Amino acid sequence: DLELHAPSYPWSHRGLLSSLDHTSIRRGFQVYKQVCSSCHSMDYVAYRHLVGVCYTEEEAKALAEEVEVQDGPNEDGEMFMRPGKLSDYFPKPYPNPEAARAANNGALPPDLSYIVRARHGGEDYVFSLLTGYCEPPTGVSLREGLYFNPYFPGQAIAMAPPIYNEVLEFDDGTPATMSQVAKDVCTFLRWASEPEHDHRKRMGLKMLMMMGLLLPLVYAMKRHKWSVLKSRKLAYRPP
Amino acid sequence: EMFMRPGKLSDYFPKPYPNPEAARAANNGALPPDLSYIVRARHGGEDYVFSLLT
Amino acid sequence: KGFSYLITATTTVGVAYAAKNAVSQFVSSMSASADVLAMSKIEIKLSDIPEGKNMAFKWRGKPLFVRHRTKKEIDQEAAVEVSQLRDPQHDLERVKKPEWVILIGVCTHL
Amino acid sequence: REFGHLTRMRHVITYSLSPFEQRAFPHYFTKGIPNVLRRTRACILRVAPPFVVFYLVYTWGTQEFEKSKRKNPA
Amino acid sequence: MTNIRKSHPLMKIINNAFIDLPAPSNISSWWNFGSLLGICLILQILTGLFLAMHYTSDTTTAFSSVTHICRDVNYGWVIRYLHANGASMFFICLFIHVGRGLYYGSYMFLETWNIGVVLLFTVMATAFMGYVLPWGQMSFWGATVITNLLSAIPYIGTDLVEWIWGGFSVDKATLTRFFAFHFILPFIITALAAVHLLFLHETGSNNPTGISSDMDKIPFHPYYTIKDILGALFMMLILLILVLFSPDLLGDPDNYTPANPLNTPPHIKPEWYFLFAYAILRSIPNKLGGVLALVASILILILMPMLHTSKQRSMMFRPLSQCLFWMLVADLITLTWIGGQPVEHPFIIIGQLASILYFLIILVLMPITSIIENNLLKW
Amino acid sequence: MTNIRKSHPLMKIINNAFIDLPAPSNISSWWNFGSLLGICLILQILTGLFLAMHYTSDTTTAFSSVTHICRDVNYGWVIRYLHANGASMFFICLFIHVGRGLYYGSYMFLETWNIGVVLLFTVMATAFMGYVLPWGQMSFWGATVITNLLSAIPYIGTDLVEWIWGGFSVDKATLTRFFAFHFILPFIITALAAVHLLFLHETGSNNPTGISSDMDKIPFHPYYTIKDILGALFMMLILLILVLFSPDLLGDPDNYTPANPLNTPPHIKPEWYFLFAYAILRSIPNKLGGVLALVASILILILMPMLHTSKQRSMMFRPLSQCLFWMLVADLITLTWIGGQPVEHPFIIIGQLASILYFLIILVLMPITSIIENNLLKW
Amino acid sequence: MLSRFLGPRYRELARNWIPTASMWGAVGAVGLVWATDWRLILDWVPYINGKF
Amino acid sequence: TLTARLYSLLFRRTSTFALTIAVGALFFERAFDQGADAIYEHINQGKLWKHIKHKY
Ligand code: HEM
Numbered sequence A: 001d002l003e004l005h006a007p008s009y010p011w012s013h014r015g016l017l018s019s020l021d022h023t024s025i026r027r028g029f030q031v032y033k034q035v036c037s038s039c040h041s042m043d044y045v046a047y048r049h050l051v052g053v054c055y056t057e058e059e060a061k062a063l064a065e066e067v068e069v070q071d072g073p074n075e076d077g078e079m080f081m082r083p084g085k086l087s088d089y090f091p092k093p094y095p096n097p098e099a100a101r102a103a104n105n106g107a108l109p110p111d112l113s114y115i116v117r118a119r120h121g122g123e124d125y126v127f128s129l130l131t132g133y134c135e136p137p138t139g140v141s142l143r144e145g146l147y148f149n150p151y152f153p154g155q156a157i158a159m160a161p162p163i164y165n166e167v168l169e170f171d172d173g174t175p176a177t178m179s180q181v182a183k184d185v186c187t188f189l190r191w192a193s194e195p196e197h198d199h200r201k202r203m204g205l206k207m208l209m210m211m212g213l214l215l216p217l218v219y220a221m222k223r224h225k226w227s228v229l230k231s232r233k234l235a236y237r238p239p
Numbered sequence B: 001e002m003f004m005r006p007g008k009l010s011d012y013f014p015k016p017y018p019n020p021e022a023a024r025a026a027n028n029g030a031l032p033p034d035l036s037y038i039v040r041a042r043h044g045g046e047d048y049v050f051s052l053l054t
Numbered sequence C: 001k002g003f004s005y006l007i008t009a010t011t012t013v014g015v016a017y018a019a020k021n022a023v024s025q026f027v028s029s030m031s032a033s034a035d036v037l038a039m040s041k042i043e044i045k046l047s048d049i050p051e052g053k054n055m056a057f058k059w060r061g062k063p064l065f066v067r068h069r070t071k072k073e074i075d076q077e078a079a080v081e082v083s084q085l086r087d088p089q090h091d092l093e094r095v096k097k098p099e100w101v102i103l104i105g106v107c108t109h110l
Numbered sequence D: 001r002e003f004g005h006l007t008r009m010r011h012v013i014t015y016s017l018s019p020f021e022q023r024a025f026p027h028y029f030t031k032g033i034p035n036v037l038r039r040t041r042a043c044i045l046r047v048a049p050p051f052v053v054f055y056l057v058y059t060w061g062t063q064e065f066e067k068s069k070r071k072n073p074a
Numbered sequence E, F: 001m002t003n004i005r006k007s008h009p010l011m012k013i014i015n016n017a018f019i020d021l022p023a024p025s026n027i028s029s030w031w032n033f034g035s036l037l038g039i040c041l042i043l044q045i046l047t048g049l050f051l052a053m054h055y056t057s058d059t060t061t062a063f064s065s066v067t068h069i070c071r072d073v074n075y076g077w078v079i080r081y082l083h084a085n086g087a088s089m090f091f092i093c094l095f096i097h098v099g100r101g102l103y104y105g106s107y108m109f110l111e112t113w114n115i116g117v118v119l120l121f122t123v124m125a126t127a128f129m130g131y132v133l134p135w136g137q138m139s140f141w142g143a144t145v146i147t148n149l150l151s152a153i154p155y156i157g158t159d160l161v162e163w164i165w166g167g168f169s170v171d172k173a174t175l176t177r178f179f180a181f182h183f184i185l186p187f188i189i190t191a192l193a194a195v196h197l198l199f200l201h202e203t204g205s206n207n208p209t210g211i212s213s214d215m216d217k218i219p220f221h222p223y224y225t226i227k228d229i230l231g232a233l234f235m236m237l238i239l240l241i242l243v244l245f246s247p248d249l250l251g252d253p254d255n256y257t258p259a260n261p262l263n264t265p266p267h268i269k270p271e272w273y274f275l276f277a278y279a280i281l282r283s284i285p286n287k288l289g290g291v292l293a294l295v296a297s298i299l300i301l302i303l304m305p306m307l308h309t310s311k312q313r314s315m316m317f318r319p320l321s322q323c324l325f326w327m328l329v330a331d332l333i334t335l336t337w338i339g340g341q342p343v344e345h346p347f348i349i350i351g352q353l354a355s356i357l358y359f360l361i362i363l364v365l366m367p368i369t370s371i372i373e374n375n376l377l378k379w
Numbered sequence G: 001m002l003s004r005f006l007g008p009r010y011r012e013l014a015r016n017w018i019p020t021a022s023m024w025g026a027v028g029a030v031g032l033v034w035a036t037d038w039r040l041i042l043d044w045v046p047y048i049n050g051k052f
Numbered sequence H: 001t002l003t004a005r006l007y008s009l010l011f012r013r014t015s016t017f018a019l020t021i022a023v024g025a026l027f028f029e030r031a032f033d034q035g036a037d038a039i040y041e042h043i044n045q046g047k048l049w050k051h052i053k054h055k056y
């Protein structure tokens, strides 16, 4: 059965030397925190990772301090809840995978730290999925707790449409239309999959300029040494 | 949820305390050691353990 | 000779730049990673610590003691002789800010 | 196998120039481009045809595969 | 009273191998890929070792340790993706190196060609075991398929597979032993490359004409040290474009998912530099015959000297043999494409004809065509 | 026709190194410990690689991984304690080997002697980093003391110690990078041993008389292959007596306790084959002077050829210098014993006198006594 | 290595190679300063110190 | 000419050649990083964290 593949969107980071828009990264973290995180985990991203990316240290510390985290046994050997801290990772919405599937209709919502890198199509795919919900076409019936997403493999997703217009409020006043929310969160997810994206592209620009100097000059070096061979003349003078 | 089941051959010996802190709380601040290597981890070995116990 | 050796010297300058960046990255990888630099590295406390109260912490794996020894105790441990101690130490020298002594909390015997 | 004991050669004269006397890119474009084109013409009818057939096989295989997942009125 | 470069016992052999070695004055860019390979090897050992300073081979931490390298170790993603794409550059260079050997008759240097076959097998084993180390979905299930391929061996096959596993399936024992073998194998490869060069220097290099060139030898140092250095710079350019602009171009997204033994990926394709052999193995329905064809598709390199019937060493002056050579290259590209595709209606028949052509060129068409070329030259 | 043993390029090297090598007909059992060393090396690579098939270098599992090796891996206790007591045998053989070099003037072979010093340092680094890997109490706190010794270095001590740690203390990063270095280093040791034998074969072996033996050379193969086999069997006997009858004789019980950074052991000693140096460093009150002495006690081996003042090469015909040599061996034994003891009365003054005496023997007494012997023989 | 190398020709050799040796020492110093970004010294170079 | 003087002073001696390379490498690292960073921050003007941090 054929599948519907995501179109290519002109992400501001699509270009070869184009960085991410870090305001979109900040709005995307807001989307994840207020929308996805009730069911999705981001095990490999911590609050300290946000500093200098989308939030200042005081801001990210207050974001960490907004949640409560379980800390190692105390003197009595009891666990306890303490405010979050910058070195804490993003909270996990479920204690174990089984409770995660129990809170759904039996489906596991994936960890989102790598979801952009772990899917063919990446941000284009995630934007298409979040924006692509429609009523199934004639001849198609889905079980209870499944929803037709023409971009999801099988076209029957257990995730209900999570984003809609005014699903959250953005702190810069950015209108929270569904496509705006999806674009912001997909930017944030590309960052979460590749936190080295901007630095990698800056290093790529530097490598291209260094190579555009070194390759011609080392080529000139080789031809300086080799001109003795490339211009020499042979004469055969048999008796 | 986590449950309780009868033990198995492949199961290791039960731990009396969930963590070191509960062990120290139950024993007046002292953590009673694991005994898998107690003879090897002492100078004098089973001679030491025998003399300590007696 | 100047044209040829100018080419060689500019080549060497660019190669030195590239080599320094590569070797610096490989050296820096062995330097403390961001998780190490964000864990026990530092832990700023707060005014939550009351007077003469051991608000305890878990920094560096070591339980940290933070008290607010109120006048007398400080003075008493100045009154506590140094020579009498097995480990000769001065109370004010031990606690740079007399009011609060900060000792890593762990017995130094088995 | 070292210089001085490789072979017997007689009556061959080599003329060479110091690299500091000659240019490193002489006639690089006016002569290099005709030579590139000559070499391309000399090898193209032996290199290109199998890759043309691969492009055709790839196009046909991909297209036929995508036509085999299409719906049939049956 | 002596030059240290020639008198000193270590400098003597360095001098004889890389400075005063007589090299043909006319070896082309296709001869650079030896030094490139030696550079690739070195790169893989360097990055790998720095990766080994942070990787942990327990199944609860391997994926996490790699994520830690790519997110927290200073310049750890540089080293990680340098290693990952340097393996692909290693195989690109290896395939070009072997293609050069086939095209110019370099296999007529029997000992170095046989060492090269050994090196090819060992590099493949190294890369295969290393790809499991991330412990992603593709790592796990590729190890599963290619290890289960060893059960097709009669009588002792299942015991051999379970012994390599260290258990009933691919699991913790397999991962830790694969880390150990992956650490040690490139050093064995280093020794084998040294023996390789020892055997090569007994005759020196072949050249594109296929004619002995002792009357036109040049010192290695000024000419081919600078030529090899420029080749290395170009290889680095391509590798860095890969690392810094498309780090994931030659990889599969599903290896960014942790391994799940209860969930098979819908596709299980090995690395691209195995796909041709994969395609060959998927062509024939029989398990054991499929494995034998997969091994023969590399062991057949040992047959090139026995299958050489041409009067000329190289294919420089053999138009029809060049035609067949480029058909073989196109067929290998076809097999790579087919092995990357599902086993479905068009691709099955395409892969089957491609595998038959692969063997029918090397074993049949190339010797007969060389004989015809001999007759066309009246010898 | 040829003998392929002499004509084949690989077999020619093997033939010249161990078959047709002219060897002195009178070299004693003390000349066996070279072949023991290379055997120990191989054993350490063999068992360690098999340990590395099960060991994991994460601090949450390293001690547990070793317990699993010794308790559940088939014959894993054999491989583990063979590896530990083979490290001890390595150092026994190294000390006897260097003592033979000192006694017979073998250091007059400058290049192979200097490569041997390099080898001694590299074996020491490998053993040190390997001992941390079980992550016991002694592992952790020995790493702690020995690495924080390097803070004594002026202006860059703290920066370099923290860089070696990869953090503020000895922790997870240190253990993983120590595993990587411990894996790689023995192969560099193998390369250095090959260079070592290359430099030795330039002149051949010295003999107990110290006189050149070229008039009485015998072929290596039948005589010293069988003699080295007998020596290897005797070494295996001692090693297996250790492994099978007192596995824990040369170790420490506190490494059967998992590392506790909160609690330090009452005694923190290196392994026995470090104690002589640990005594010397502990003799000097100054941190940096102590480290410099602990380094000079092994760098002073580089000075022996310049300290040689005798007309004769070996100690066979010099009773007074034999006396000083056995005093040196006794002083090394007393330094080992002192280093195994607490820093308290009377071991402090004993360690000081022993540390002074070691250098006073090598640097002063041995040269002056050789000069006196020279004059007693009227030259 | 004590007085076989102690003579007029050897002091002339020393003086002949002292400028080359001192230049090489300056080369080593500059390379060490630049490789390590030694701010102690580098904080004095007029435009380079902009990096800090 | 300029290149003749360059060779006469800074290139002829190998130790002075190496000194020229070391000083040039220092100043080249400075200038090339400065220029490439300006290029990359102009290509991505307004998007980077430095560009937007001044409000938080
Ligand atoms: C570990 C990977 C390898 C390394 C490092 C390596 C290294 C080298 C080097 C440096 C050369 C000389 C330069 C050159 O002509 O390219 C060379 C030549 C050669 N290699 Fe390899 N090689 C490797 C793998 C192989 C393989 C897989 C084969 C094929 C069986 C092979 C067969 C040859 C042959 C036949 C030559 C001589 C070519 C000629 O002179 O015409 N090598 N190798």
Ligand code: HEM
Pocket: E041, E044, E045, E047, E048, E049, E050, E051, E052, E055, E066, E080, E083, E084, E087, E090, E123, E126, E127, E130, E131, E132, E133, E134, E182, E183, E186, E187, E189, E251
């Ligand atoms: C012949 C040379 C080598 C080849 C071809 C090779 C190939 C590979 C490949 C393909 C991977 C998986 C890359 C990925 O994650 O996508 C890998 C991973 C790894 N290799 Fe290597 N490798 C080589 C040498 C080494 C050496 C010598 C070491 C150890 C010193 C090493 C250590 C590692 C480690 C720790 C990993 C796991 C982390 C990671 O995925 O990057 N490699 N290797």
Ligand code: HEM
Pocket: F030, F031, F032, F033, F034, F035, F037, F038, F041, F094, F097, F098, F101, F104, F106, F107, F109, F112, F113, F114, F115, F116, F117, F119, F120, F123, F189, F193, F196, F200, F204, F205, F206, F207, F301
């Ligand atoms: C990696 C460890 C080492 C190995 C495998 C090794 C191997 C060997 C072998 C096989 C021999 C020839 C047989 C013999 O005379 O014993 C030898 C000789 C020698 N080794 Fe070592 N060695 C090692 C470490 C050292 C050390 C630490 C030194 C001293 C600093 C050293 C200095 C010498 C000397 C001077 C000789 C020549 C002895 C003579 O002929 O009289 N080696 N070595």
Ligand code: HEM
Pocket: F041, F044, F045, F047, F048, F049, F050, F051, F052, F055, F066, F080, F083, F084, F087, F090, F123, F126, F127, F130, F131, F132, F133, F134, F182, F183, F185, F186, F187, F189, F251
């Ligand atoms: C130069 C040769 C070597 C020496 C001297 C050496 C020394 C040591 C020592 C002393 C230990 C601690 C043993 C103990 O637990 O008490 C150790 C542990 C270890 N070594 Fe090595 N080693 C060598 C080579 C190797 C190699 C080549 C490998 C890997 C291929 C290796 C892998 C290990 C492993 C995995 C451990 C931890 C398991 C254990 O503690 O027994 N070793 N090594």
Ligand code: FES
Pocket: C107, C108, C109, C110
């Ligand atoms: S020091 Fe606290 S127990 Fe003795």
